[PDB]
């Protein structure tokens, strides 16, 4: 092979040689697999069980009662009780095996989030020899089914005294002890099943997320909202700045672009004659990943005809307050943005949220008088904004446009104070298209953003139903995006036609499910609420 | 006249309205009552009364502008699928010059708001005599003719908003689809299941037999395959400890687009622990029959596989569904005896199947493997007589690489398929929890993929590693919720039950 190999290889070789030499010189100075290879030993034991007729994978086990119902029903037993006239069948995973004797063993069946003891005594078993056989077969982590009578140990521990234990599914890997558990983030994310097995709060987090999604659906349906399914791929890239997920279709011999937002289809449906629509689904944005961003994410978006953002500002209040009260049981939650050892914030979700106007509050905070709302589009405003950003030690990467500088100032000043849920309303028209202009104050739009714990969770604005202005903004977007080529594919010509056919005054709303889940589960990472976060594979040999 | 001329003239008129301070896009119009509630509450009125003490505000799209002189104009407002009449009279209107002004700017298709008093005409038609009509959103395009509404299938599918505006049954179809999904969710939630969400981008595609979509992740230089089935993640979750899980979601397939197949389609997959396919066979009966009874109002439905002018089939959804076996019924239909089920992974059985397909004129493009030949034979002989819902169970393991082996019959699996109207809607089996047999099956699929049969399932190390941690005896079930909508809404086309179906681009 390699001449003189590598000093390393050479080095590695000797140690081995030294290792085996010392090993033989020691053991013989005085085939069994080493105990650390639990997988091989367990696999060979299972294979031997298969060959001699004791197949460890039964097709069907009839469960009479769940563990939670068992605990609820038989928690009233006194110590030493034994209901010899009641027979029940339960099932679960073994988490402990305390052998107090040759004929008395204790198992800890953990399932459904609860624990039930199993005190196996050969005196109560059907016979001694099968008791020994089954207790020799069983290991920790094995899924087993237990048929027996309820009882309570002299200590006062509820348990099921088994008449017959059947192995349902053996475990071929070492199962970590619950006292240390699983604490490595990479291991927890790569093996979510092990995370659920060893950690109990993960199951509660996902139950909470499911409860969140159910509540929203129920509320909207009672209001009279219809659930819809819009396409997830389109043949048009669109004019959005967010980078899409490209895909190829061999039959159409073309590329298909993943959905960024279902807004256009919802508005077309409202044009069709469905006044109130909603959809909870996935959005795919080919962008960066951090604690509060994921490339694919679940959002709930609804559209309501004959409404403005003022009505949405009350509907959102009712939604959020009712959901928090229904799930957490109160209006005040505790959030740890930095972790269980960092500072804890008390977030109050009382019905009437705080409402602030961006321009006035920014003037109050920044300390000076920004230009009038009609003069933001002038380069003078851009210049004075740049001067203020430099003076206030705020950094904005280029380009230093008015929209980006204003967003940076808002994030730096108006956003460190949004601990409790707060509405920020009346954005400048430049920072936001697709929102109807403000009916009273010129130069502002008709949107609002709900911020909880300095993070945006909701986003709603009066939909622009003017075909001419919408077409102008779409063409400006396409001009900026295309940089040559043809805007033909950066302009939706069917949405414009629908708008020309006529859209009623509508209000659109959209909420991030994941972020709400993190806020209601005390999780500072979005991956804590995703069941299977995307992890690049670990190179292996 | 010319639609282009109409559009140009209406655009000019609306621009003139804008520049004159008569904004045709008001920010807010406070609607007080819905059209359905208006019809329900004031249908008791006598033919000719006029309740002048009640003033309500409604809104909707004008469907007809009939003129009966210079002082009386009838409008046909259409809202939530109902009809209302607006008899604008100069006397009741706020002002005469304003009556003329508003009547010279409104045309059919416009979204308008009407504030007025309920009443009835001498002909006994419920109406709202307006006190003030407000134009909310003009319609710049000429709507199709009243007697020549949208009938071209391509136009209806490409422009769904026009279909909703002109055709009323489309809204009912989509309402029924929503009802189907809500019923499934309620059934599974009350059973004790937990709704989950599984990744739509998978490093390795798996869970079904299909051609995947390939995308490129930006933060992750690795490419990602779109979801074809959430099966391998549901099983991992059941390994985790959640005994009953379910998910209604979108699956993607890179196959051809036709009148029955779409690139993205909605399916429901629930997974039960400590269950077998014999329990799912009862649960599916209960839930399908209950859904049919709850939506249609009865157990018997009528389906037209080739349009309303074709033959009508009466499908009965009595809770108990017929049950048949693939091998036995296939032998009975073929009038012969197939080789023993324990010799199905061999070559002579493949030769026998090929000879039978050739003799019976069954068509199967290459590769002519045993699984594909069996599928073609079953489709040609078994599913063509399953009008009423029927269970076809005990499939060979060559046709199911993720189903557990049958208890008593060798070479078969513990699975079943629900066939209604000669089409499959459901697919369920007892999950395979043995890591060694699952690895052997995965290995066999790779052999095939290597030489042709690219549709063969891919290999996954993570799923096998999870199986090595102990998967309880479980049963999985999956229903394609597009065909259920087609059968319940009486539509022989997937595009009918899809809001925006994928269409071939037009020149």
């Amino acid at each position: 092979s390699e001449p003189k190999l590598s000093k390393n290889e050479l080095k590695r070789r000797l140690k081995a040689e030294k290792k085996v030499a010392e090993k033989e010189a020691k053991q013989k100075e005085l085939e069994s697999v080493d105990p650390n290879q639990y997988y091989k030993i367990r696999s060979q034991a299972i294979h031997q069980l298969k060959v001699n007729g004791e197949d460890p994978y039964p097709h069907k086990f009839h469960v009479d009662i769940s563990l939670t119902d068992f605990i609820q029903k038989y928690s009233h037993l006194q110590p030493g009780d034994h209901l010899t006239d009641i027979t029940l069948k339960v099932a679960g995973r073994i988490h402990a095996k305390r052998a107090s004797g040759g004929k008395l063993i204790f198992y800890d069946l953990r399932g459904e989030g609860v624990k039930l003891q199993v005190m196996a005594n050969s005196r109560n078993y059907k016979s001694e020899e099968e008791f020994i056989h089954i207790n020799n077969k069983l290991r920790r982590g094995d899924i087993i089914g237990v048929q027996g009578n309820p009882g309570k140990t002299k200590k006062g521990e509820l348990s099921i005294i088994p008449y017959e234990i059947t192995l349902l599914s053996p475990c071929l890997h070492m199962l970590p002890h619950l006292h240390f558990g699983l604490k490595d983030k990479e291991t927890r994310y790569r093996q979510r099943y092990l995370d659920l097995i060893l950690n109990d709060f993960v199951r509660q987090k996902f139950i909470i997320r499911s409860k969140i999604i159910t509540y929203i659906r129920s509320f909207l349906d009672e209001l009279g909202f219809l659930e819809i399914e819009t396409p997830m791929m389109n043949i048009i890239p669109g004019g959005a700045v967010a980078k899409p997920f490209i895909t190829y279709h061999n039959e159409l011999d073309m590329n298909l672009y993943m959905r960024i937002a279902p807004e256009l289809y919802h508005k077309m449906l409202v044009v069709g004659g469905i006044d109130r629509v909603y959809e909870i689904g996935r959005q795919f944005r080919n962008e960066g990943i951090d604690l509060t961003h994921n490339p694919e994410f679940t959002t709930c978006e609804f559209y309501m005809a004959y409404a403005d953002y003022h009505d949405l500002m009350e509907i959102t209040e009712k939604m959020v307050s009712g959901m928090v009260k229904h799930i957490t049981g109160s209006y005040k939650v505790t959030y740890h943005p930095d972790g269980p050892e960092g500072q804890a914030y008390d977030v109050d979700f009382t019905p009437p949220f705080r409402r602030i106007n961006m321009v006035e509050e920014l003037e109050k905070a920044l300390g000076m008088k920004l230009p009038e709302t009609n003069l933001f589009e002038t380069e003078e405003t851009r210049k004075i904004l740049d001067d203020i950003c430099v003076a206030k030690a705020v950094e904005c990467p280029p380009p230093r446009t008015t929209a980006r500088l204003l967003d940076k100032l808002v994030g730096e000043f108006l956003e460190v104070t949004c601990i409790n849920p707060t509405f920020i309303c009346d954005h400048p028209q430049i920072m936001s298209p697709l929102a109807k202009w403000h009916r009273s104050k010129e130069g502002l739009t008709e949107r609002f953003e709900l911020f909880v714990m300095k993070k945006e969770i909701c986003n709603a604005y009066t939909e622009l139903n003017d075909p001419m202005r919408q077409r102008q903004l779409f063409e400006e977007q396409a001009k900026a995006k295309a940089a040559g080529d043809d805007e033909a594919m950066f302009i939706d010509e069917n949405f414009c036609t629908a708008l020309e056919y006529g859209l009623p005054p509508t209000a659109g709303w959209g909420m991030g499910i994941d972020r709400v889940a993190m806020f209601l589960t005390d999780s500072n990472n979005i991956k804590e609420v995703l069941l299977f976060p995307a992890m690049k594979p670990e190179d292996k040999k | 006249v010319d639609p282009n001329q109409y559009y140009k003239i209406r655009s000019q008129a609306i621009h003139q309205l804008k520049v004159n301070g008569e904004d045709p896009y008001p920010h807010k119009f406070h609607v007080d009552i819905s059209l359905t509630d208006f019809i329900q509450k004031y249908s008791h009125l006598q033919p000719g009364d006029h309740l002048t003490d009640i003033t309500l505000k409604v809104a909707g799209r004008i469907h007809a502008k009939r003129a009966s002189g210079g002082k009386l104009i009838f409008y046909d407002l259409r809202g939530e699928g109902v009809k209302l009449q607006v008899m604008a009279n100069s006397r009741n209107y706020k002002s005469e010059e304003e009556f003329i002004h508003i009547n010279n700017k409104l045309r059919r298709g416009d979204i308008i708001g009407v504030q007025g008093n309920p009443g009835k005409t001498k002909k006994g038609e419920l109406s709202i005599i307006p006190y003030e009509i407000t134009l909310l959103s003009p319609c710049l395009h000429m709507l199709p003719h009243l007697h020549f509404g949208l009938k071209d299938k391509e136009t209806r599918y490409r422009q769904r908003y026009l279909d909703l505006i002109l055709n009323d049954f489309v809204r009912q179809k989509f309402i029924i689809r929503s009802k189907i999904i809500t019923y499934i969710r309620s059934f599974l939630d009350e059973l004790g299941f937990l709704e989950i969400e599984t990744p739509m981008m998978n490093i390795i595609p798996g869970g079904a037999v299909a051609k995947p979509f390939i995308t490129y992740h930006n933060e992750l230089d690795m490419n990602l395959y779109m979801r074809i089935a959430p099966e391998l993640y549901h099983k991992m979750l059941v390994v985790g400890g959640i005994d009953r899980v379910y998910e209604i979601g979108r699956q993607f397939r890179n196959e051809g687009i036709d009148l029955t197949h779409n690139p993205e389609f909605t399916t429901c997959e629930f997974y039960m622990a400590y269950a077998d396919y014999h329990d799912l066979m009862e649960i599916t009966e209960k839930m399908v029959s209950g859904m049919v009874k709850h939506i249609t109002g009865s157990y018997k439905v009528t389906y037209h596989p080739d349009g309303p002018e074709g033959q009508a089939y009466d499908v009965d959804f009595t809770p108990p569904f017929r049950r048949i076996n693939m091998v036995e019924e296939l032998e009975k239909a073929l009038g012969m005896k197939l080789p023993e089920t324990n010799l199905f992974e061999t070559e002579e059985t493949r030769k026998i199947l090929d000879d039978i397909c050739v003799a019976k004129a069954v068509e199967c493009p290459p590769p002519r493997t045993t699984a594909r030949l069996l599928d073609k034979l079953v489709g040609e002989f078994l599913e063509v007589t399953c009008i009423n819902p029927t269970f076809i169970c005990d499939h060979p393991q060559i046709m199911s690489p993720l189903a557990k082996w049958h208890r008593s019959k060798e070479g078969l699996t513990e699975r079943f398929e629900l066939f209604v109207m000669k089409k499959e809607i459901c697919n369920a089996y007892t999950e395979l929890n043995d890591p060694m047999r699952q690895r052997q099956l995965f290995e066999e699929q790779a052999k095939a993929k290597a030489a042709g049969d690219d549709e063969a399932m891919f290999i996954d190390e993570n799923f096998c590693t999870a199986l090595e941690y102990g998967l309880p005896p479980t049963a999985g079930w999956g229903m394609g919720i597009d065909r259920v909508a087609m059968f319940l809404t009486d539509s022989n086309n997937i595009k009918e039950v899809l809001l925006f179906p994928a269409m071939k681009p037009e020149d």
Partner: peptide, 21 residues
Amino acid sequence: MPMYQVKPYHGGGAPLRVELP
């Protein structure tokens, strides 16, 4: 401001009595 009331499509008061097997 309370939006007009439209009636829920998917019935109401638990219209579907799902028959759990």
